[PDB]
Design a protein around this ligand. Structure first.
Ligand SMILES: COc1ccc2ccc(=O)oc2c1CC=C(C)C
Ligand SMILES: COc1ccc2ccc(=O)oc2c1CC=C(C)C
Ligand SMILES: OC[C@H]1O[C@](O)(CO)[C@@H](O)[C@@H]1O
Ligand SMILES: OC[C@H]1O[C@](O)(CO)[C@@H](O)[C@@H]1O
Lengths: 297, 297
């Protein structure tokens, strides 16, 4: 069953300026280039998933408008299905103002989340789970997403072992409400930002420190930028892959999303956790030498 | 003859994020609000001119596309005529990435001028000068704009004194090619940035220092932000108006454009240079207490 991979989360219009040096206050500078790029964690993962060759679908809140039309068009050009999008009656699809330093790949994100209602459990209740082999959830509205996770669980209990839906979750924002999401999913992604916010100084210590929160049987993954990525499963052994830096790092916008999608892809292809860590570091690393995601395969 | 006022220059899509504190490098912050706003020096002056009650027209290069459609729609909502726009066959209308500090009104502009061809003399040669009582030119492609200025001059020589077209020019960028524009126009606007670039420390010393470059009979104007604005005409007397700060300064984006348009409006209404300086400081000052230009009248 090579069904689709469903990613649930944010879609964002990223307005991107590429500069030599980060601008100072009240200054006026001319940019190297500018672009609009579809963004949002779950949305970027769909881009990378479809570039890796996997049929995938995005599910997130969008509002009808010019921004949405651009985003929907871009989704469809990547081959990312949007039939599960939760269209709202009023509002604006979120957007960000992004500055990318070209000399080191740093990225400044000024985000506008638009009081747009999040994907609700009632929205997710309508999804036909039989279309997906893997469902990835970007931690967002935790109380509602738990019910989605519970719905997937009840479905899985009634399926034969080979037709159970694999589940991954990302806890990327250091917000207390999201931490309960650690206890769901077969694969849990914890951000370096969340690890540090929680007092850890390395992926390894974060993995050892946090593993008692995950569902028994789950794999906890913590990427650490230039120091590579680490994972920890039920057998208690810490796994690690080094980073694979490109010659010049020019754009780290969405680099964590590339890692996440690559790990999801690798595991969904039957690879082992060690293999998935290495592939994730490789694809994310070479994204960092590119503007955007084209050229990552 | 209360004909139109024509402003020649840039139109820009300003993508604006309003923040508490200016973001640091590689950080991720959430904005207070975001908006798109039509921008560009000549374009912003048209906005303020139409808010002051004057029929006006914009002339600048635009490329057909979604950005242009937004800009044209916004022009027409302000009542700014766009029939003289120089549509190009290929390219993108310029846009900027703007961050506005809400606690002091500072503005960071990251601009993308799009290799879009500038309004040429051949474009301007087609304009029906009999429709305009005043023509303002944003210094840009100086060699071509001089020929426009020369065309207006030849027209004026053949008109009765009361039907001569008044001309103003802005020299806002510290670029050597633009300085020849000092010798044209009845009113010359020199920016604080250009004054400083040229070694001056105050409007007054800039006016005294630069006046020998202007056409005999012209008035030289130099605005200096919180220190108000100064002017110098042929009689040799230095005129000055203080600033009129709002209670809270929240948005200085386009504040010089508001001053320019207000001086043009005031002089075109027959007021004296002293009056035009005060009005310009008043309207620009109270723009600085507002986001955008609505509410400036
Ligand atoms: C945030 O993600 C980053 C950030 C900076 C770099 C720099 C070199 C590199 O090779 O990869 C980077 C990554 C992706 C690697 C991982 C493990 C996610
Ligand atoms: C650049 O323009 C600025 C910048 C900052 C302020 C702050 C207070 C104020 O009252 O006006 C300002 C202006 C406009 C005044 C002039 C003379 C152009
Ligand atoms: O927080 C949302 C921001 O983060 C990103 O998804 C990067 O992974 C950007 O595309 C978006 O602007
Ligand atoms: O340099 C162009 C920039 O300057 C402004 O015109 C401000 O006067 C902005 O509207 C535009 O982004």
């Amino acid at each position: 069953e090579e069904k689709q991979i469903l990613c649930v989360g944010l879609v964002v219009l990223d307005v991107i300026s590429l500069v030599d040096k980060y601008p100072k206050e009240d200054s006026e500078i001319r940019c190297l280039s500018q672009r609009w790029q579809r963004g949002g964690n779950a949305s970027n993962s769909c881009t990378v998933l479809s570039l890796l060759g996997a049929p995938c679908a995005f599910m997130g809140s969008m509002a009808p408008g010019h921004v949405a039309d651009f985003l929907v068009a871009d989704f469809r050009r990547r081959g990312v299905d949007v039939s599960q999008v939760a269209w709202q009656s009023k509002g604006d699809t979120p957007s960000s103002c992004c500055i990318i330093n070209n000399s080191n790949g740093n990225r400044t994100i000024v985000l506008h989340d638009t009081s747009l209602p999040d994907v609700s459990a009632t929205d997710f209740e309508k999804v036909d789970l039989t279309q997906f082999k893997w469902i990835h959830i970007e931690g967002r509205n935790a109380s509602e997403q738990v019910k989605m996770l519970q719905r997937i669980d009840a479905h899985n209990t009634r399926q034969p072992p080979e037709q159970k839906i694999r589940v991954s979750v990302e806890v990327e924002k250091p917000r207390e409400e999201l931490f309960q999401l650690f206890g769901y999913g077969d694969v849990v992604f914890v951000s370096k930002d969340v690890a540090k916010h929680l007092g850890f100084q390395s992926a390894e210590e974060a993995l050892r420190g946090l593993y008692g929160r995950v569902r028994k049987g789950a794999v906890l993954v913590c990427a650490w930028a230039e120091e590579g990525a680490d994972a920890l499963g039920p057998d208690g052994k810490l796994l690690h892959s080094d980073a694979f830096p490109p010659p010049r790092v020019v754009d780290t916008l969405g680099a964590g999303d590339t890692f996440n999608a690559s790990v999801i892809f690798s595991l969904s292809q039957g690879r082992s956790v060690q293999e998935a860590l290495r592939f994730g570091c490789q694809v994310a690393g070479k994204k960092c030498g590119l503007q955007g995601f084209d050229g990552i395969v």
